[PDB]
Amino acid sequence: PLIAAASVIAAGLAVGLASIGPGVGQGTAAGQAVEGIARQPEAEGKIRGTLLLSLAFMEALTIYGLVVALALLFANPFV
Amino acid sequence: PLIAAASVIAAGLAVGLASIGPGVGQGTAAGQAVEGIARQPEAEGKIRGTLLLSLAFMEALTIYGLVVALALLFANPFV
Amino acid sequence: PLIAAASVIAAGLAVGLASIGPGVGQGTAAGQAVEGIARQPEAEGKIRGTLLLSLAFMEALTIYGLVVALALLFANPFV
Amino acid sequence: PLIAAASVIAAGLAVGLASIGPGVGQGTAAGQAVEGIARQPEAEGKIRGTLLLSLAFMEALTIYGLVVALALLFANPFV
Amino acid sequence: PLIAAASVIAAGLAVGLASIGPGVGQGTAAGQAVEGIARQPEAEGKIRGTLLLSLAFMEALTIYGLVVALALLFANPFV
Amino acid sequence: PLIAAASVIAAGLAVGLASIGPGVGQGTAAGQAVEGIARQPEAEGKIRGTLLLSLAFMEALTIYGLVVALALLFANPFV
Amino acid sequence: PLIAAASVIAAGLAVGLASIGPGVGQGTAAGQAVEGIARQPEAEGKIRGTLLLSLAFMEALTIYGLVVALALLFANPFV
Amino acid sequence: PLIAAASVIAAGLAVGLASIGPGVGQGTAAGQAVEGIARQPEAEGKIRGTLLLSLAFMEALTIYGLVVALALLFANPFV
Amino acid sequence: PLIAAASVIAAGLAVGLASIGPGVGQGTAAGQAVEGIARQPEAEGKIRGTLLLSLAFMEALTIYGLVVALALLFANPFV
Amino acid sequence: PLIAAASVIAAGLAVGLASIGPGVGQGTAAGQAVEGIARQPEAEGKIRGTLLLSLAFMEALTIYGLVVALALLFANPFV
Amino acid sequence: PLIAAASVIAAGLAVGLASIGPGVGQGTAAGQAVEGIARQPEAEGKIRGTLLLSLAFMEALTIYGLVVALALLFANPFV
Amino acid sequence: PLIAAASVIAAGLAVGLASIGPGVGQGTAAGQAVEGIARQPEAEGKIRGTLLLSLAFMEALTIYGLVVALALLFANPFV
Amino acid sequence: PLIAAASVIAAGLAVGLASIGPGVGQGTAAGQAVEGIARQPEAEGKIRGTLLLSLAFMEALTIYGLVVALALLFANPFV
Amino acid sequence: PLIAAASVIAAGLAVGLASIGPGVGQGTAAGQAVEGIARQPEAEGKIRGTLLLSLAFMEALTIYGLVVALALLFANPFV
Amino acid sequence: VGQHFYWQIGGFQIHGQVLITSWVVIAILLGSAAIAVRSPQTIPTGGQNFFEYVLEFIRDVSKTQIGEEYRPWVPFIGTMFLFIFVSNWSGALLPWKIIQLPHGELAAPTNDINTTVALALLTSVAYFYAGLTKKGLGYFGKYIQPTPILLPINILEDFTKPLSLSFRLFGNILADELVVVVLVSLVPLVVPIPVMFLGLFTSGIQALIFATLAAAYIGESLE
Amino acid sequence: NTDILATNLINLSVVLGVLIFFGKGVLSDLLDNRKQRILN
Amino acid sequence: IEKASLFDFNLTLPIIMAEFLFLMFALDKIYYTP
Amino acid sequence: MTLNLCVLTPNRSIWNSEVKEIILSTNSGQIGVLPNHAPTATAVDIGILRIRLNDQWLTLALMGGFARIGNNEITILVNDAERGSDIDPQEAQQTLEIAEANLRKAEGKRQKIEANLALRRARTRVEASNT
C-alpha cells in the first residue's frame, strides 16, 4: 500500500544522499595524498598507509546508508 | 498505515543526511593529514594518532544517525 | 494518528540536519590540527589538548539534536 | 490534533537548523585556534582563553534553538 | 486551530534560521581573532575588547529570532 | 483565521531570514578587523571607530526584519 | 480574505530576503575597509568617506525591501 | 480575488530577489575599492569616480525590482 | 482569472531572477576594475573605456528579464 | 485556459534562469579582462578585441532564453 | 489541454537550465584567456584560436538544450 | 494524457539538467588550457591535442542527456 | 498509466542528475592536466596516460545513470 | 500500482543522486594527481598506483547507488 | 501606466509618437550643430569646442574599434551616437508631461521597438556593407574557418547580433521612463530625482555602448 | 491640448538645474583645457 | 481606446530608417565633412 | 613631495632622483605606481621601466630582479640595467639579430636556456631604443 511505496523512496534517498558526502571527501583525501607523493616519493608507504586507512572511514559513511537502504527493501519489518 | 509510511521515510532522511556532513569533514581532515606526512614524515605516529582520534569523532556524528534510523525501523514505538 | 506520524518524521530531520554542521566543522578543525603538527611536532600536547576540547563542543551540537530526536520517539509527551 | 503535530515537527526544525550555523563556525574558530598554536606555542593560554570564550558564544546560538525546541514539546502553551 | 499550528511552526523557523547567519559569522570573526593573537600576543587586550563587542553584535542577531519565537509561543496576541 | 495564520508564519520568515545575511556579514567585517589589529596594534582607535559604525549598518539590515516582525504580530492591521 | 493573507506572507519575503544580499555585501566591503585602515592609517579619512558612502548604497538595497514590506501592511491598495 | 493575491506575492519576490545580486556585487566592488585606496591613497579621486560610477549600475538593478514591485501594487492593470 | 494570476507572478520572477546574475557579475567586474586602477592609476581612461563597456553587457542581461516582465504585465497577449 | 497560464509562467522561467549563468560569467570574464589592461596598458586593444568577441558568446546564451520567452508568448502555437 | 501545458513549461526549463552551466563556464574560460593575453600578447593568435574553439563546445551545450526546447513548441509529436 | 505530460517535462530535465554539469567543467578545463598557452606558447599543439580530446569527454556527458530527451519525444515506447 | 508516467520522469532525473557530478569533476581533472603540460611538456605521455584513464572513470559514473535511464524506458519490467 | 510507481522514481534518485559526490571527487583526485606528475615525472608508478586504487573507492560509492537502483527495478520484492 | 500608442494611417498604421518625438531630436541636432559651422575660426571660439570635442570623441571610438579606415565610417557612427544620445537626454530633461496628446505619452523616440530594431538593422546593414565591400562577395566572415562543424553556431550568431543589440537599447530606455512614470503616481517629483539621475546616467551610456559596439562589428567584418 | 499639473515638471526642474550647472562646470574644465592645448 | 500591444512591426521601421539616413547625410554635410 | 626611487645594479646605482610615475613590468606583466602606494614586494621581469617625472618621461631597460616598494620609496634590485636613451638606437637591433639566429642554431637544453634568456634580454633591449 502506502507503506511499501514510502519505504522504497527512502531506500533511494538513503543511498543517494549518503553517497554525496564521501564523494567529495574521498576526492580531497586522494587529491592531496597524490600531491604528497609528488613532494616526497620516499614516503609512499607512509601515505598509502594513512590514505587507505582514512578512505575506509569514508567508506563506512556510505555503507551505513546502504545498511538502511537494504533493510527497507529486504529485511523490512513494516510489510 | 500512515505512521509506518511516515517513519520509514525519515529512516532514509536520517541516515542520508547524516552521511553528508562527515564525508566533507572526513575528507578535509584526512587530506591535510596525508599532506602533513609529506611535509615531515617523522611525525606519522603523531599524525595517525590525531587523525584516527578525530575521525572517530566525525564517525560518531554518523552513528548517531544510524542509531535513530534503525530505531525508526526495529525498535519503533509507534507501530 | 497524525501526531505520532509527524513526530517520527522530525526525529529524522532533527538528527539528520544537526549532523551536517559538525561534520563540516570537525573536519576543518581536525585538518588544521594535523597540518599544525607537521609545522611543529613538539607542540602535540598543546594541540591535542586544544583540538579535543574544541571537538567536544562540536560533538555537543549534534547531541542536542539527538536529545530532541530521542525525545520525539521515547519520552514523547504528546502520545 | 493538528496543533500538536505542527509543534512536534517544528521542535525538530529548531534544533536541526540551529546545529548548522554554529557547526561550521566552531570549525573555523577552533581550526585557526590550533593552527595559531603551531605558529607560536608560548601563546597558548591567550589562545585557549580566547577560543573557549568565543566557542561559548557559538554554543549559545544552538542552545537558543534547543530552549525553543524543548518548549515546543514540554512547556507547550498551545496543547 | 490553524492560528496556533502556524504560530508554532514559525517559532521553529525563526529560532532555527537565525542561528545560521551568526554561526558562520561568529566563527570567521573569532577564528581570525585567535590567529591574530598568535601573530601578536602583546595585542591580546586590544583583540578581546574588539572581539567580544563584535560577537555581541552577532549574538544580538540571533537574540532577535529568539524574542520573536518566544513571542510566538508565550506572548502570542493572536490566540 | 487564515489571515492570522499566514501573518504569523511570515513573522518567522522575516526575522529568521534577516539574521542570515548579517550573521555572515558581521563576521568577515570583524574578522579582518581583528586580524588588522594584529598587524598594526597602534591603529586600534581608527579600527573600533570604523568597526562600531560598520557593524551598526549591518545591525540595521536585521533590525528591519524585526520592525516588520513586530508589525506582523502586534500592530497588525489585518486582524 | 486570501488577499490579506497573501499580502502578509510577501511582507516577510520582501524583507526576509532583502537582508540577505546586502548583509553579505556590507561584510566584505567593510571587511577590506578595516584591513585598509590597518595597513596605512594615514588614509583613514579617504576610507570612511568611501566606506560610509558605499555602505549607503547597500543600505538602500534593503530599504527598498522595507518600503515594499511596509506598503503591503499599511498603504495596501488591495484591502 | 486570486489576482490581487497573486500580484502581491510577486511584489515580495520581485524586490527580495532583486536585492540579492547587488549586495554581493556592491560588496566585492566596494570592498576592492577601499582596499585600493589604502594601497594607493594618491588615487582616491580616481577610485571614487570609478566606484560610484559602478555602484550606480548595481543600484540600477535593484531599482528594476522595486518599480516592478510598485507596478504590481499600484499601477496594476489587472485589478 | 488564472491567466492574469499566473502572468503576474512570473513578472515578479523574471525581473527578480534575472537580476541575480548581473548583481553578482557587475561587482566582480567592477571589483577588479578599481583594483587595477590602484595598481597603475595612469590607465584609468583605459579601464573606464572597458568597464562601462563591460557593465552594459551585464545591464543587458537583467533587461531581457525586464523586457519580458513588462510584456507579461502590460503588453500581455493572453489576457 | 491552463495553457495560457502555463506558458506565461515558463516565460518568466526561461528568461529568469537564462540571465543567471551569464551574469556570473560576464563579470569574471570582463573582470580579469580589466585587470589585464592595468597590467599591460600597451595591450588594451588586444584585450578588447578578445573580450567583446567572447562576451558575445555569453550574451548568446541569455538571448536563447529571450527567444524562447517571446516564442512562448507571441509566436505561441498552443493557444 | 494538460499535454500542451506541460510541454510549454518544460521548454522554458530546458533553455533556462542550460544557460547556468555554460554561462559560468564561458566566464572562467574567457576570463583566464584574456588574463593570459596580458602575460604574453605574442601568443594572441594562439589564444584566440583555442578560446573561440573551446567556447563553441560550451555554446554547443546550450544549443542542445534549445534543439529540445524548440521541439517542445514547434515539432512537438504529442499534440 | 498523463503519460505524454510526464514524458515531456522529463525531456526538459534530461537536457536542461545535463547542460549544467559539463558547462562549468569545460570552463575550468579551457580556462587553464588557454592560460597554459600563455605560460609556454611552444607547446600549443600539445595543449590543443589534450584539450579537444578532454572537451570531447565532457561534451559526451550532455550528449547522453540529449539521447534521453530525444528518446522521450520521438522514439517514445510509452505512447 | 501512472507507472509509465512516473518511470519516465525518473528517466530524465537519472541522466539529468548523472551529468552534473562528472562534468564538474572532469573539468578540474583536465584543467590541471593541461596546465601541468605547460609546466613540463616532456611529461605529456605520462599525463595523457593518467588523464585519459581517469576520464574513463568519470565517464563510467555517467554511463551508470544512462544504463538505468534506458532501462526505465526500454527494458522496463513494470510496464 | 502506487508501489511500482514509487519504486521506479527512486531508482532515478539513487543512481542519479549517487553520481554527484564521486564525480566531483574523482575530478579533484585526478586533478592534483596529474599536476603531481607534472612536478616529478619519475613517480608515475607511485602516482598511478595510488590514484587508481583510490578511484576504485569512489567507484565503489557510485556502484552502491547502482546496486539499489537495480534492486528497485529487477529484484524488487514488493511487486 | 500606459504602454500603448496611437497609430497614423497612410495606407498602413505607423506610430504617431515615434515620428513626432524623433523630429525634435532631428531639429535639435541639425538646428544646434549648423549654427556653429556658419563662420568657423582657426582657434575654436566658445561653443565650437563642444562640437569639436564630440567629433574628436567619435574618431576615438571609430579608430579603436575599426582601425586605419575609420574615416569613412565616422558620419555613420557619429549619427548612431548622437541620434541615440540626444533621444535619451530629451526623455529625462525636456518636460513633456505638461503637453497632453489625446491618446499617448511622449517621452523618447526609442521607447518603441520600431526605432530600436530599425537602428539595429541600420547597424546590421553597415557590417554587411563593410563585410561585402572589402572582402569577397563569394565568401565572407560567416565562412566556417576554424572548424567545419561550427556552422549552426555561426549561422545563429548572425541573428543574435542585431537582436541582442536591439533589446539592450529598447529595454533600458523603456525601463528608465517607466520608473519615472510609476514613481510620479506615488509621490511628487522631489523624491524620484535621484532615481532619475541614476537613469539619466545610464541613458547616455546605452547610447555610447551602442556606437562602440556598432563600430566593433564593422572591424570584425573587415578582417 | 496642454495638460497643466505640478507633479511632473517641477522635479524635472531640480535635476535639470543641477545637471546644467555642473555640466557648465565640467565643460568649462574640459573644453577650455582643450582650447589651451591647441593654443599651446 | 485599446490596451498596450507593443512589439509593433508597423511601417515605423522604414520611417525611422529613412529619417535616420536623412540625419546621417545632412549631419554629414553640416558637421562631419566641414 | 612624492616618492623617491633608486634603481641599483650589482656595481652601480643608476637612478636616485624623485619621480612621480613609474610603470614597471613584472612576472605578472604591468604595474602602475603613484605615490602613497601600499608597501608591496614584487619580482620584476627582464623588460623596460617607463618613468614619468614632471615634464619629460623616459624608459630605462632593466634585466630583471626584485622591486619592493614602501612608504613612498621604490628600491629596485636588478642584475643589469641600461637607460633607454643611452643605448644607441639601431645598434641593439644588430645585437638582437645576433641573438635571433643563435636560437635558430640552439640545440640542447643549455643552449635553449642561454639563448632564450639572452634573447629576451636583447629583445627588451631594442624596445627601449625606440621608446
Contacts of C2 in chain B (CB under 8 A): 2
User: Residue L4 has which C-alpha cell?
Assistant: 505524454
J78 in K contact zone (CB under 8 Å): yes
CA atoms of O177 and N59, how far apart (whole Å): 58
Q: Using CB atoms within 10 A of its CB, is residue R108 exposed (0-12), middle (13-18) or buried (19+)?
A: exposed
Question: Between β-strands R65-69 and R40-44, what pairing exists: parallel, antiparallel or unpaired?
Answer: antiparallel
I60 in H contact zone (CB under 8 Å): no
Contacts of O72 (CB under 8 A, 6+ apart): none
CA atoms of M52 and A58, how far apart (whole Å): 26
Question: Bridge partners of J36?
Answer: none
CA atoms of J30 and J40, how far apart (whole Å): 15
Distances (CA, A) of R101 to G35, N20, R88, R109, R120: 52, 55, 21, 17, 13
- Interface contact flag, J66 O167, Cβ < 8 Å: yes
Cβ count near R86 (within 10 Å):
12
CA atoms of G76 and O50, how far apart (whole Å): 50
CA atoms of F33 and E58, how far apart (whole Å): 15
Cβ count near N31 (within 10 Å):
27
Length of chain I measured in residues:
79
Contacts of G62 in chain F (CB under 8 A): 60-61, 64
SS3 of residue D1 by DSSP: coil
The DSSP 8-state label assigned to residue R46 in this structure reads S
User: Residue K50 has which C-alpha cell?
Assistant: 583555442
Phi, psi of A39 (to 5 degrees): -80, -30
SS3 of residue I40 by DSSP: coil
CA atoms of L13 and N9, how far apart (whole Å): 14
SS3 of residue R4 by DSSP: strand
I61 in O contact zone (CB under 8 Å): no
The DSSP 8-state label assigned to residue Q29 in this structure reads I
Residues followed by a gap in chain E, C→N > 2.5 Å: none
Query: Of I57, I54, I34, I55, whose CA–CA distance to I44 is shortest?
Result: I34
Question: What is the per-residue DSSP string for chain K?
Answer: -HHHHHHHHHHHHHHHHHHHHHHHHHHHHHHHHHHHHHH-GGGHHHHHHHHHHHHHHHHHHHHHHHHHHHHHHTS-TT-
Whether there are 3 or more C-beta pairs closer than 8 Å between J and R is yes
Contacts of D47 in chain C (CB under 8 A): 50
I66 in J contact zone (CB under 8 Å): no
Nearest CA in chain G to H79: G78
Length of chain L measured in residues:
79
From Q7, Q10, Q13, residue closest to O13, measured CB to CB: Q10
Contacts of R38 in chain H (CB under 8 A): 38-40
CA atoms of K51 and K55, how far apart (whole Å): 6
CA atoms of L46 and B10, how far apart (whole Å): 53
Contacts of O138 (CB under 8 A, 6+ apart): none
Query: Of O66, O56, O62, O82, whose CA–CA distance to O74 is shortest?
Result: O62
Distances (CA, A) of K39 to N21, Q30, R40: 36, 46, 20
Query: Of C65, D2, C74, whose CA–CA distance to B78 is shortest?
Result: C74
One-letter amino acid for residue B19 of the chain: S
CA atoms of K56 and J61, how far apart (whole Å): 12
Strand boundaries in R11-94, DSSP class E: 13-15, 21-24, 31-33, 40-44, 49-52, 57-62, 65-69, 73-78, 81-83
Question: Bridge partners of R13?
Answer: R8
Question: Bridge partners of H76?
Answer: none
Contacts of G31 in chain H (CB under 8 A): 31
User: Residue H67 has which C-alpha cell?
Assistant: 518599480
What is the side-by-side strand order in the sheet with R21-24? R31-33, R21-24, R49-52, R57-62, R81-83
From K7, K32, K51, residue closest to L32, measured CB to CB: K32
Nearest CA in chain C to D25: C25
User: Residue O89 has which C-alpha cell?
Assistant: 537626454
* Distance from the H22 Cα atom to the nearest Cα atom in chain G, whole angstroms: 7
Strand boundaries in chain E, DSSP class E: none
User: Residue K14 has which C-alpha cell?
Assistant: 530546458
Are I66 and I34 within 8 A, CB to CB?
A: no
Q: Helix C2-39 to helix B2-39 angle, to the nearest 10 degrees?
A: 0
| Secondary structure in 3-state letters for C24-54 | HHHHHHHHHHHHHHHHCHHHHHHHHHHHHHH
Contacts of H73 in chain G (CB under 8 A): 68, 71-72, 76-78
From C3, C29, C46, residue closest to D27, measured CB to CB: C29
One-letter amino acid for residue B29 of the chain: A
Question: What is the per-residue DSSP string for A4-42?
Answer: HHHHHHHHHHHHHHHHHHHHHHHHHHHHHHHHHHHH-GG
Phi, psi of O37 (to 5 degrees): -95, 5
F9 in E contact zone (CB under 8 Å): yes
Q: Which chains touch E (3 or more CB pairs under 8 A)?
A: D, F
Q: Using CB atoms within 10 A of its CB, is residue R40 exposed (0-12), middle (13-18) or buried (19+)?
A: middle
M33 in L contact zone (CB under 8 Å): yes
Cβ count near N45 (within 10 Å):
11
| Domains of chain J listed by start with CATH number | 1-76 (1.20.20.10)
The DSSP 8-state label assigned to residue F77 in this structure reads S
Are H22 and H59 within 8 A, CB to CB?
A: yes
Length of chain F measured in residues:
79
One-letter amino acid for residue R102 of the chain: N
Query: Of M12, K72, H64, whose CA–CA distance to J16 is shortest?
Result: H64
CA atoms of N38 and O75, how far apart (whole Å): 56
Contacts of C23 (CB under 8 A, 6+ apart): A21, B20, B21, B22, B23, B24, B25, B26, B58, B61, B62, D23
Distances (CA, A) of O62 to F39, H63, I47, O76: 50, 33, 18, 10
SS3 of residue F28 by DSSP: helix
Query: Of F68, F70, F8, O181, whose CA–CA distance to G71 is shortest?
Result: F68
G32 in R contact zone (CB under 8 Å): no
Question: Between β-strands R13-15 and R21-24, what pairing exists: parallel, antiparallel or unpaired?
Answer: unpaired
C-alpha torsion angle, residues I75, J1, J3, J5 (rounded to 10)? 50
| Domains of chain R listed by start with CATH number | 1-87 (2.60.15.10), 88-131 (no CATH)
Nearest CA in chain N to A38: N36
Question: Bridge partners of R52?
Answer: R21, R57
Optimal mutation site among D2, D46, D53, D73, interface E, most CBs of chain E within 10 A: D46
Place of cell 492560528: E3
C-alpha torsion angle, residues M10, M12, M17, M20 (rounded to 10)? 170
* Distance from the I2 Cα atom to the nearest Cα atom in chain Q, whole angstroms: 19
Question: B20-31: b or e for each residue (b if 16 or more CB lie within 10 Å)?
Answer: bbbbbbbbbbbb
CA atoms of A18 and N18, how far apart (whole Å): 8
CA Rg, chain R, in Å? Answer: 16
CA atoms of K11 and J10, how far apart (whole Å): 8
- Interface contact flag, B78 C44, Cβ < 8 Å: no
Are D30 and C58 within 8 A, CB to CB?
A: yes
Question: Between β-strands R49-52 and R21-24, what pairing exists: parallel, antiparallel or unpaired?
Answer: antiparallel
Sign of torsion over alpha carbons O39, O43, O45, O48: positive
Question: What is the per-residue DSSP string for chain H?
Answer: -HHHHHHHHHHHHHHHHHHHHHHHHHHHHHHHHHHHHHH-GGGHHHHHHHHHHHHHHHHHHHHHHHHHHHHHHTS-S--
Cβ count near M42 (within 10 Å):
10
CA atoms of Q1 and P21, how far apart (whole Å): 42
Query: Of A41, J20, L60, F4, whose CA–CA distance to B37 is shortest?
Result: A41
Q: Using CB atoms within 10 A of its CB, is residue O51 exposed (0-12), middle (13-18) or buried (19+)?
A: middle
Cβ count near Q21 (within 10 Å):
13
Query: Of K8, K21, K65, whose CA–CA distance to J64 is shortest?
Result: K65
CA Rg, chain L, in Å? Answer: 18
Q: What angle do CA J8, J10, J15 make, to 5 degrees?
A: 105
Distance of CA D69 to the CA centre of its chain: 13
Place of cell 609546466: M39
Annotated domain spans of chain O: 1-223
Question: K38-53: b or e for each residue (b if 16 or more CB lie within 10 Å)?
Answer: bbbbebbebbbbbbbb
User: Residue M30 has which C-alpha cell?
Assistant: 583536465
User: Residue K22 has which C-alpha cell?
Assistant: 555554460
Report the structure determination method: cryo-EM
Nearest CA in chain G to R72: G40
| Secondary structure in 3-state letters for chain O | CCCCCCEEECCCEEEHHHHHHHHHHHHHHHHHHCCCCCCCCCCCCCCHHHHHHHHHHHHHHHHCCCCCCCCCCHHHHHHHHHHHHHHHHHHHHCCCCCECCCCCCCCCHHHCHHHHHHHHHHHHHHHHHHHHHCCCCCCCCCCCCCCHHHHHHHHHHHHHHHHHHHHHHHHHHHHHHHHHHHHHHHCCCCCCHHHHHHHHHHHHHHHHHHHHHHHHHHHHHHC
DSSP H helices, chain G, are 2-16, 20-39, 45-71
